[PDB]
Each structure stands twice: as structure tokens, then as C-alpha cells.
Coordinates of C-alpha atoms and ligand atoms in Angstrom, one line a residue:
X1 CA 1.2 18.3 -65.8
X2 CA 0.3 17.6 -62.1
X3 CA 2.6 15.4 -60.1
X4 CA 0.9 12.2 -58.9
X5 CA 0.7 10.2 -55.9
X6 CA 0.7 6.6 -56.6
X7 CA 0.9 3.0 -54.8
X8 CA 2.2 -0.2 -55.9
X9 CA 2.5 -3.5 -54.2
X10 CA 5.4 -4.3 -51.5
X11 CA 7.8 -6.5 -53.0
X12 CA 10.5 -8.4 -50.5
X13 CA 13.3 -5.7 -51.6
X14 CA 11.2 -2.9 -49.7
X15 CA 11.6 -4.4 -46.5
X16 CA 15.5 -2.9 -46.8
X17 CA 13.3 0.6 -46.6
X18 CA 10.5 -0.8 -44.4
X19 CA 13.1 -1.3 -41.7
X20 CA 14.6 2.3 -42.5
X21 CA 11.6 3.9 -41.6
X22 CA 10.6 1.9 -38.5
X23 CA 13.7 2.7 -36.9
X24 CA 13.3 6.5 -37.6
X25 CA 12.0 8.0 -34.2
X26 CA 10.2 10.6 -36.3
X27 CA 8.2 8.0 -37.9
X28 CA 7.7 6.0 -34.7
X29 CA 6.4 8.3 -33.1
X30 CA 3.1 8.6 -34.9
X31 CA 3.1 4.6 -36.4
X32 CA 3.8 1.8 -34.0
X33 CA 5.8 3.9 -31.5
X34 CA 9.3 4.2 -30.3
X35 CA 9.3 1.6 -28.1
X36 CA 9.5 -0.2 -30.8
X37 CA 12.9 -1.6 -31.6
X38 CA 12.5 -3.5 -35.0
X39 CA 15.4 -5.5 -36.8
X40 CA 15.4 -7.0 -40.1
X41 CA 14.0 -10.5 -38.6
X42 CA 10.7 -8.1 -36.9
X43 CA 10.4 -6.5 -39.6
X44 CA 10.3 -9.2 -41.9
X45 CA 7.5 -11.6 -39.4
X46 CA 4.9 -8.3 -38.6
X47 CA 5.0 -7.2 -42.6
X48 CA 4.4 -10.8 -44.2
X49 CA 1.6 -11.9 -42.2
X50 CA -1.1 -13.0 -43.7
X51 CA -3.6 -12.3 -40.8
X52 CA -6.1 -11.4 -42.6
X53 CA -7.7 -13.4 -45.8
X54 CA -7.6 -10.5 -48.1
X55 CA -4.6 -8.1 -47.4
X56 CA -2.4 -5.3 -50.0
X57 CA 0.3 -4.1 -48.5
X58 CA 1.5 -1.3 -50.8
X59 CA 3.9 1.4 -51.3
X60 CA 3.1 5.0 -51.6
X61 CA 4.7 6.7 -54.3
X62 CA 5.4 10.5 -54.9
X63 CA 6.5 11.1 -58.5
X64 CA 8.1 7.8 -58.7
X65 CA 9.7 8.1 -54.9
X66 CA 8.6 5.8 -52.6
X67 CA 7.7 7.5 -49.4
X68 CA 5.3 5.5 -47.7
X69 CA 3.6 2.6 -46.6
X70 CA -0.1 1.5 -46.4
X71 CA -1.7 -1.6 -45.7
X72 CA -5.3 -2.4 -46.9
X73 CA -7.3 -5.5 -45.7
X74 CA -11.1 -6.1 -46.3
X75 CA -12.9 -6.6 -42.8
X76 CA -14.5 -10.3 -42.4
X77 CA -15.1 -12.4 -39.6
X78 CA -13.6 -11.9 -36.9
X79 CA -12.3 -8.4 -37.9
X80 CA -15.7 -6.8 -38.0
X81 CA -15.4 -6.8 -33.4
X82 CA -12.2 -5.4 -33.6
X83 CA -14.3 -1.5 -34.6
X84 CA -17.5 -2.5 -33.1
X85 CA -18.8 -2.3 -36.5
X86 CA -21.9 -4.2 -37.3
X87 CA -21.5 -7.0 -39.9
X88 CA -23.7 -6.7 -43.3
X89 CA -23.3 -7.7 -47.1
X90 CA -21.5 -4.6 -47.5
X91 CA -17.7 -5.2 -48.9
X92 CA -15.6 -3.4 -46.6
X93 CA -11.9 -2.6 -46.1
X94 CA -9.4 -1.0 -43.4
X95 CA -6.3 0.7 -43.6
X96 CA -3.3 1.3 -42.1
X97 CA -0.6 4.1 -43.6
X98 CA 2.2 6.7 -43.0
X99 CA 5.0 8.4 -44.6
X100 CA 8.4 7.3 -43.5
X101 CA 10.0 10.3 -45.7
X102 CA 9.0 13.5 -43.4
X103 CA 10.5 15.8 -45.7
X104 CA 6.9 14.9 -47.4
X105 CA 4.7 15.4 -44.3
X106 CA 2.3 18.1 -44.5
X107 CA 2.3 18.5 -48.0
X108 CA -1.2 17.1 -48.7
X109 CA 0.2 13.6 -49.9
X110 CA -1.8 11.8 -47.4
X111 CA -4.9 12.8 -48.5
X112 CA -4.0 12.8 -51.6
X113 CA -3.2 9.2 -51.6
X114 CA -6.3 8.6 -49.4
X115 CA -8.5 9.7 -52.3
X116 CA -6.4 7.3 -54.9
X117 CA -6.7 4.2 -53.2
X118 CA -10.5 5.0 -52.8
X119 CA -11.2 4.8 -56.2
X120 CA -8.9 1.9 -56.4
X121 CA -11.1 0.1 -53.8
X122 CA -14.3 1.7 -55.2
X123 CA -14.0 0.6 -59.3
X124 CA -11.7 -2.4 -59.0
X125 CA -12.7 -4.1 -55.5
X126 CA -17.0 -2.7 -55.0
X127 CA -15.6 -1.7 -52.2
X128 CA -18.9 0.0 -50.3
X129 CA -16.7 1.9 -47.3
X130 CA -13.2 2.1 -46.8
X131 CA -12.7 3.0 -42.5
X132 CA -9.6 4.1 -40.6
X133 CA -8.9 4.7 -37.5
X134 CA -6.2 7.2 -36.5
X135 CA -5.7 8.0 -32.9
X136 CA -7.8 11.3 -31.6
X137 CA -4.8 12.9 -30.6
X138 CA -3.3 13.4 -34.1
X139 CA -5.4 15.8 -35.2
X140 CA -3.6 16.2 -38.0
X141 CA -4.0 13.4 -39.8
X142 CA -7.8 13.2 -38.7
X143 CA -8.1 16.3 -40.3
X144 CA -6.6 14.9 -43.6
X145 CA -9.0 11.7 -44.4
X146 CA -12.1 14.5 -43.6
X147 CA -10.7 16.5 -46.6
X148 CA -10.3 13.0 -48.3
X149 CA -14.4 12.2 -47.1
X150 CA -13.7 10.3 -44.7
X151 CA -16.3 11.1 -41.9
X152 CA -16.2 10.7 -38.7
X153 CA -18.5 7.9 -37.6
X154 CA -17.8 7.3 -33.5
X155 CA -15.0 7.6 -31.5
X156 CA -13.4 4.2 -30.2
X157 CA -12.4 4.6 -26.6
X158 CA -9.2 3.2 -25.5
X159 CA -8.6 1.4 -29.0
X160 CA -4.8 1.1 -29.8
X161 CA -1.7 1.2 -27.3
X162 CA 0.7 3.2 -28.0
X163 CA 4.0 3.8 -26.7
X164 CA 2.4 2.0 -23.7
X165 CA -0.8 4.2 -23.2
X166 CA -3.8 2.6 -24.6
X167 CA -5.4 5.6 -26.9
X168 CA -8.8 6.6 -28.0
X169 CA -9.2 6.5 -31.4
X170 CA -11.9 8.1 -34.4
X171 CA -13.5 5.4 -36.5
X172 CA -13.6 7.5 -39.7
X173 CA -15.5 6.2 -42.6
X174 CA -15.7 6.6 -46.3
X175 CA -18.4 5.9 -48.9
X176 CA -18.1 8.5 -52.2
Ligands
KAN1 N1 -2.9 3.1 -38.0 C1 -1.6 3.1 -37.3 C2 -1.4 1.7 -36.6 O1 -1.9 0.7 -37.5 C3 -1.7 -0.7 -37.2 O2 -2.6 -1.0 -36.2 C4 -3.8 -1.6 -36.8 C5 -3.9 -3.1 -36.6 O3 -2.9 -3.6 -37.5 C6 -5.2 -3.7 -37.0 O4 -5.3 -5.1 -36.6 C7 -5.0 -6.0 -37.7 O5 -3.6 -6.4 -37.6 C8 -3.3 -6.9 -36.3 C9 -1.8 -7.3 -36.2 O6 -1.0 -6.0 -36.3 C10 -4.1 -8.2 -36.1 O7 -3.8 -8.7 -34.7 C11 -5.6 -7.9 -36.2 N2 -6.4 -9.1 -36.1 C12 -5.8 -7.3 -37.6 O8 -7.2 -7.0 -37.7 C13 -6.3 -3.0 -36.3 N3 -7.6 -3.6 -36.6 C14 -6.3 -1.5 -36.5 C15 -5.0 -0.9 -36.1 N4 -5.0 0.5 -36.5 C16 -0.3 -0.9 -36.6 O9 -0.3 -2.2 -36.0 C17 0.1 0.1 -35.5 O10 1.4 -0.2 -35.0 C18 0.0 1.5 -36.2 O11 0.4 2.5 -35.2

């Protein structure tokens, strides 16, 4: 009788809402920042890239709603440099998400979801770890993925800029 959070696959007709939310300031300001100034044809180029071999990009679903975004790519190559993280045989994935609907912040969704795609990752993909790596000054969300079992692993100094400041991030890390 719970409600769920769900995901499904980004389909060319959720770029109308892809471009809603990347215009909202609210949204920006936590997920590729408000200096950002996206139009359909941005939009459209940065969320059909294929630049990486094995890439989901999803939509995060709250009782049928679609609130959110995530984008899920398994780390190969090149990708492994990009987190300092030492190559094995382990099968290994990123992500990248946010809520563009903030009347659903803080309502546990995005750990929620964290925990869903997971298991996803975990019985359909063998994933062995699943890493993110939000900035250190949102707080926030790092505190999310640790309820989710994410741990932290290092930080990453000077990782992602942001609104023009080039941030240290967590590399956060989960494995069950
Ligand atoms: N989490 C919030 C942030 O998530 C993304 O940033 C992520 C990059 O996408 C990843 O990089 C991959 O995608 C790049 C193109 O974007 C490629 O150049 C690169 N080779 C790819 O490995 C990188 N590893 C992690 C980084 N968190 C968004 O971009 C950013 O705006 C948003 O605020």
C-alpha cells in the first residue's frame, strides 16, 4: 500500500520536461548551475550523447509523476581517471541525478530512488559498486546516498565547476 519510486528510460518527448527543469533556477542551482542558459537545441546535443559506451538515462518517477532525472553509465576506459579510481575486473557504474519537481525535495525520494536503481544495477547488470560524486558543499544530498549505503570513500579536491568555481567533491561508493 506504499507509494513507490520508480525510473524508466528517457524517451525524445521528455526533453519538452528536460528543458523545463534546466531553466528552473531552483534546479540549477544544485545540477549544472545557473549560468547555464539551455534551449531546446542544448538541451537536445548534452542529453543524447552517447559519450560513454554503456549509458541509461532514465526518468525518476513518484507514483507515476515524473520528477526527476538520473543518468547511469558504467565506468570503462578512460572514465576510470576521471575519479582517480583504480581500474580492476570489477563492473562498475556512475551516476548523475536530481529532482527538477522541488515540491518533492526533502521528502526522502532521493534516497529512495538511490536504493531502487541499486538493485536494478546489482540483479540485472552484476553491477559490483555503483559511485557518485556530489559536491561537499551539499550536505544534504551527501547525507542522503549514506542512508542509501553509499560510503564515503575520499574526497576529490577541486572536481566539478560549478557556477564558475571549481568544487571539491565526495567520491561515495556503494557495494550492498
Ligand atoms: N552530479 C551533478 C553533475 O553531474 C554531471 O557531471 C558529471 C559528468 O557528466 C561526468 O562526466 C561524464 O560526462 C561528461 C559530459 O558531461 C563527459 O565529458 C565525461 N567524459 C563523462 O565521464 C563526470 N564523470 C561526473 C560529473 N558528476 C553534470 O554534467 C553536471 O552538470 C551536474 O551538476
Amino acid at each position: 500500500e506504499k507509494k513507490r519510486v520508480s525510473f524508466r528510460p528517457m524517451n525524445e518527448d521528455d526533453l519538452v520536461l528536460m528543458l523545463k527543469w534546466l531553466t528552473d533556477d531552483r534546479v540549477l542551482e544544485f545540477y549544472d548551475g545557473r549560468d547555464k542558459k539551455h534551449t531546446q537545441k542544448t538541451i537536445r546535443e548534452h542529453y543524447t550523447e552517447q559519450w560513454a559506451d554503456e549509458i541509461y538515462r532514465v526518468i525518476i518517477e513518484y507514483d507515476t509523476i515524473p520528477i526527476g532525472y538520473a543518468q547511469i553509465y558504467r565506468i570503462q576506459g578512460e572514465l576510470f581517471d576521471e575519479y582517480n579510481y583504480h581500474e580492476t575486473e570489477e563492473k562498475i557504474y556512475a551516476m548523475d541525478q536530481f529532482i527538477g519537481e522541488p515540491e518533492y525535495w526533502n521528502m526522502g525520494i532521493g534516497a529512495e530512488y538511490c536504493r531502487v536503481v541499486c538493485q536494478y544495477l546489482r540483479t540485472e547488470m552484476d553491477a559490483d559498486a555503483v559511485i557518485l560524486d556530489p559536491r561537499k558543499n551539499n550536505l544534504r544530498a551527501v547525507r542522503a546516498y549514506q542512508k542509501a549505503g553509499f560510503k564515503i570513500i575520499k574526497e576529490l579536491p577541486e572536481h566539478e565547476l560549478h557556477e564558475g568555481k571549481k568544487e571539491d567533491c565526495v567520491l561515495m561508493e556503494w557495494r550492498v
